Amino acid sequence: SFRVALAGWLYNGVVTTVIDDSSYPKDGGSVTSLENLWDFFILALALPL
Amino acid sequence: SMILTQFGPFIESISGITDQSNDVFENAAKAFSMFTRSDVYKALDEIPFSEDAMLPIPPTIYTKPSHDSYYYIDALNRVRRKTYQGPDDVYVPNCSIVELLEPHETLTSYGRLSEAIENRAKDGDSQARIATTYGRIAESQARQIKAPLEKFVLALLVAEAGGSLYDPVLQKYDEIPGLSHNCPLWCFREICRHISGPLPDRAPYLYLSAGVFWLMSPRMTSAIPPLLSDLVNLAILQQTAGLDPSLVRLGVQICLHAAASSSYAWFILKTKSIFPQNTLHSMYESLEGGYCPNLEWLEPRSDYKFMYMGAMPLSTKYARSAPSNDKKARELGEKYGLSSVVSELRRRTKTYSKHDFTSVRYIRDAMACTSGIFLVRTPTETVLQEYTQSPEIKVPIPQKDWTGPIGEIRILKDTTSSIARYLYRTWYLAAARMAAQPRTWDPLFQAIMRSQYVTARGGSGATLRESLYAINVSLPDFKGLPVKAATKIFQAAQLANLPFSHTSVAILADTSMGLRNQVQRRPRSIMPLNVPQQQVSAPHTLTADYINYHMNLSTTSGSAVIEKVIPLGVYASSPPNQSINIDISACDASITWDFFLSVIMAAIHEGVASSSIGKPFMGVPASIVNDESVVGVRAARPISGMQNMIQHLSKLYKRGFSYRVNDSFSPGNDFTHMTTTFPSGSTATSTEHTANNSTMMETFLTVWGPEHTDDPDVLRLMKSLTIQRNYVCQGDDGLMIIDGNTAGKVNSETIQKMLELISKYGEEFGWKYDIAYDGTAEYLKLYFIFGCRIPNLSRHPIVGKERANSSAEEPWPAILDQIMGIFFNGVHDGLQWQRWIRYSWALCCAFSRQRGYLQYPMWSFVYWGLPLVKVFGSDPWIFSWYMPTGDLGMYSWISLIRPLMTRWMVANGYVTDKCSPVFGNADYRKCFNELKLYQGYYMAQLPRNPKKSGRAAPREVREQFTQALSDYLMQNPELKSRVLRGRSEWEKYGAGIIHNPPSLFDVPHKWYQGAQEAATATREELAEMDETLMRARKHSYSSFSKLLEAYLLVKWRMCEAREPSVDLRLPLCAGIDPLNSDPFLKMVSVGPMLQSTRKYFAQTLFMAKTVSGLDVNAIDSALLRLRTLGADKKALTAQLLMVGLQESEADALAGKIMLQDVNTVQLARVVNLAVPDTWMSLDFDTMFKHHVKLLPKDGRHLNTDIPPRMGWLRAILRFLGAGMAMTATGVAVDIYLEDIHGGGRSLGQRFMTWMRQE
Amino acid sequence: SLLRLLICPWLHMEKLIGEADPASTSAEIGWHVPREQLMDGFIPYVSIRAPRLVIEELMEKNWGQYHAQVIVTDQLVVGEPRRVSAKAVIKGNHLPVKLISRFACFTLTSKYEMRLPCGHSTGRGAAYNARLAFRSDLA
RNA sequence: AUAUAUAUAUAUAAAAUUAUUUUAAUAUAUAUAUAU
RNA sequence: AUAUAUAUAUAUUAAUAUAUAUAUAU
RNA sequence: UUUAAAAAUUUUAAAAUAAUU
């Protein structure tokens, strides 16, 4: 995932890389839950690439 | 004709025509005793069977080959069987038996193995050994019953001679075909005929105490005993359960095909799933209607609280959607020639399209037609087939994920890419939290865990002894002691004054073997671990327990099955919901060192390290060991006692286990065998299995599922499931509930795909999940479909009794317990109530007399629980079996008849001028003595087991034994200091109020006796019991017990039928329908059990834990005698100290005792009134609470008034109301208090003097 | 860890029994069958080497409470001493090392075989229910 | 080298969950009352 | 004549296999 | 001025019956 995201920077016009659907918190999540907090952390670090 | 001419009065008595009496009972019992087997088969000859019972019997059943070609001899001089098809054919074969027998001296038509063959085999011959093994194993297969089959058949003829019955509820004679439509009886008679032939003797073998004698006929084989047992079971079930005669024919056909094959047990084992697979697992491919329960599971699911909320109607959308079961079923049916039977079942099942009483009865009947034999095979075959299985680990832990060694253990690197890291984390956290608790560090908990496994059962003390001998260490022998030799008590007494470094060599010693057969499953296997090996395995079991009870918390262990487990299936099989059945095949063989035990031992060794840094565990030192877990560093690091034990346990688990097999069925087999299969005798077994099950399922759903499936449906299904809300497991088996969403039943393809993912998950680390998804629940051998429990009648064979050895059976009167158990097993399965009761009457006579005779009056059997029929000129069939057993049951059935009961007495002579408050003027004291009521009532209360007296061992060696045992119990200075301080304080203060105050010094004096009575009884004790029973029968009695006398002062009143507690169209248990009137009415008017109401006055003053050697009775009586007399608190504290408690803990318990005034413990100890067994399935709690009213119907009376400071009396009143209400047939009714002779205060004072006198 | 056990004890014993009498410092302990049943010959199963004072002590130990079914054959072996191969299966218990005390240097491996230096004729083989028995010379 | 009879001794068969039933004289004697 | 309870007194402690020795015969 | 709530504890150690892993 890391290397292919890095390689997709220079094929922007034919292929667009997105984060997988199954990485987002369950049912939208809720900040009353530790696991959803850490899911948000992982997403926030991973999205800019 | 014959049976009628013999005992017409008995036929009239038990069939609800003539009033019962002791004279007809004893005369019938005479007829049963003085009666021969030829008489049995002649009576069977008298039966004119119709064409309905007719059937074509295969002639191959009689001509069979010789046993020699089926066996051979191993390279290790072991005689073992030669499999011809598959590695399963290792059971007894079907062969001739006549050419190996020598004629018995008295009965010239019967005989056992020729002594020439046995002696020649003992010399060491090949053929002699093979022949003697075959003979002994065939005898063992023919010895798997509990009594001679002809006796059960005679009881059946006795019961059925009366004909049909009249139903007091339905108002008509039931339509159950007579014996002339009973094809099992026909096959029994025809087989016995064709085997006997011209010979006058008719029985094909006579079951005896020592061994079975075969009828010397060339038409004989080794398959006949099990075939006859099957036919007897099927006949009895068809007559007392109303199976239809269209499925009993199929059952008889399958039994015949089994008897006509190579081996019988093997065919029955391969063909054990044709009735369930074609009826239960294929129902309702098309629904049209019917009702199913609407249960709702309460929110903190983990506690298992339910609530019934009515019956919801079914519809077409809830039809069966699991995958089809057609191709595989027909393949199985074709491979064994049972294709016509399979097609008949598969056809007849497709005609039921409504969830109804009739369809559940169809399933019950189709599933009661499977054979219920105890499968048997030689021990050397079990040990060589089971124990050779090894795990199939397809993705092992990489070698680069283990650190260096720390003694005997390596640690998982924190950066492991495997799936074992979640296992490691779970066990690590569990071990840390277990060891952190301060409870696990006192001497009392240490001692309790030590004494947990010191029992009177064997532990293979020999190999322990001869392994300690190999390092030149001695052991006391205690010559001349009447105690059993192979008992863990004996080992513990030996190993008292021995350092751990000495006895630690006995941890690698081998284990002996145990065996046990079953119904429809291969013979069990067993291994008892010795005392050291049970000691060193303490952290494993403690961590498993902590995981089961606190961390994972998804299990039913430690919970009552009939209050929490039944309605789990009722909920998980209701239609909107679904159920998946998950089992682990060969669970023991799949837990080894390369995936489970290594990770678990590293985890438990690391977690305990923090809170046990220098302390000793249960008598284990604080040893040292060097570690290399960190690269470049190598330093000796101290460890703890609880880590030293893990070191030794790991060096045991790494090598595997060695089993010493020595079977008594094949002469010359005493080899030793070494496996890696996890033992089934360890204390830690049943807890660690369920812990591993729960852990792997949770790591499944949380990690492995979402990382290997792509479709959104399976992901959304695995994300909405958690092991605590959708999974229940106990040991090997398991259950996974899948709730129904709003769109209805969850889709089927997604559930299937998840199932194959689970199957692929098991193969990576060894396990082989046996998954079954077909629309029925499965848990602990309880079947459910659409919320209707379905009893499995084939699992409760009426005649079957298991004998894994060659030892003789316990002598009469030891069989009456088994007969009562047969009656109760019939009760819990919903058999036809009138037919089953009558058959049990007929059967409790045949086992009533035996040699100077001694006979039981029927009143004893009525005391044990069996309900009457027609006593005292009442109406036929008034009493149900739900009448409790003992004094409560006696009061119950008496009070409902008392007026007629006394007018009959006065109508036949018995009259006196004494107005008794109960029976008026009739003299019960003379008639009940005449009618033998007191005799049975007081003979039933006498024990039927030889009380093992002390054989007066020598004083020196007995003193030494008890002293060494006490030294083993109180090993550390802290327990001894506590108990000695307690004794000192007692002699300072408590001296005088008690003379032998119980402490931790009387525990060895109970272990010594418990070693005593594990031995064999002597002829002295048998003669003593016989003479005691005769004496108790030959007295003249004047009254009942004091408790029953006090009970009989209370009258009641049957006012109103309570409202229904369940719909009258909702099947809740197959077999309990309007055809079964009384159980149906009781179930529908009382309602099933969904609550928790345990412990109706089990109060006691001792609320703490101590060694298993002590008793609650002695401590409770001491505390009660010390609290009623009002002594100083220092006396209570001294007692609690010398019973082994801490100062602060003992004083908190003293404060407890000072609270909770003692008017309740005294009554709880004086009276013995409990909820009988049969009420466990019903809702008796609300019946106690709301529907037994102590304020009579028309208000106060001045007699039923109860004083304010006597509240315990309301308990006994609620007892008597509920019992008297449940005893009568029909619906349960509101019962009101009526009148207490004397008065409330007088009866209270009567109970209070008894409570005081303690 | 294994080769040290294999080699080291023999080198030390070679200093103690380097020059003593071989007849006085020697022994051998195998499975015994009586002079009958020829339709005495013992299979070695072990070869002890130790000083005389310990051979005297080993001469009196039990050595008889260990049983096994020996199955003699009639096959010949190419080796020099005329001997017939055999087999054996211990029954009940295995010989603990404590009997061969820490003062003798025994062997860890052995083949099962019997020598026939009398009336050379190999008849039919059989099983005999042997019993363990110490076997040294006069010493 | 063995066979039979006798006497003595020894070894072997587990853990857990659930529900039900039973576990404070051993005996006698004197004085008290009662029942048969 | 018997039994039950009341106070006291007294004595009181509670299947298969194998091994060994004797004897008789070969 | 009179009445009354009374304690619902445990995991109860062993021996027998039955069900199960």
Ligand SMILES: O=c1ccn([C@@H]2O[C@H](COP(=O)(O)OP(=O)(O)OP(=O)(O)O)[C@@H](O)[C@H]2O)c(=O)[nH]1
């Ligand atoms: O005879 C044994 C039967 C099993 N139980 C205990 O149950 C646990 C699992 O028992 P098993 O391991 O025998 O079940 P299984 O694999 O044979 O299942 P199938 O292949 O037939 O589907 C083991 O841990 C054992 O201790 C024993 O107490 N008694």
Ligand SMILES: [Mg+2]
């Ligand atoms: Mg199984």
Ligand SMILES: [Mg+2]
């Ligand atoms: Mg099992």
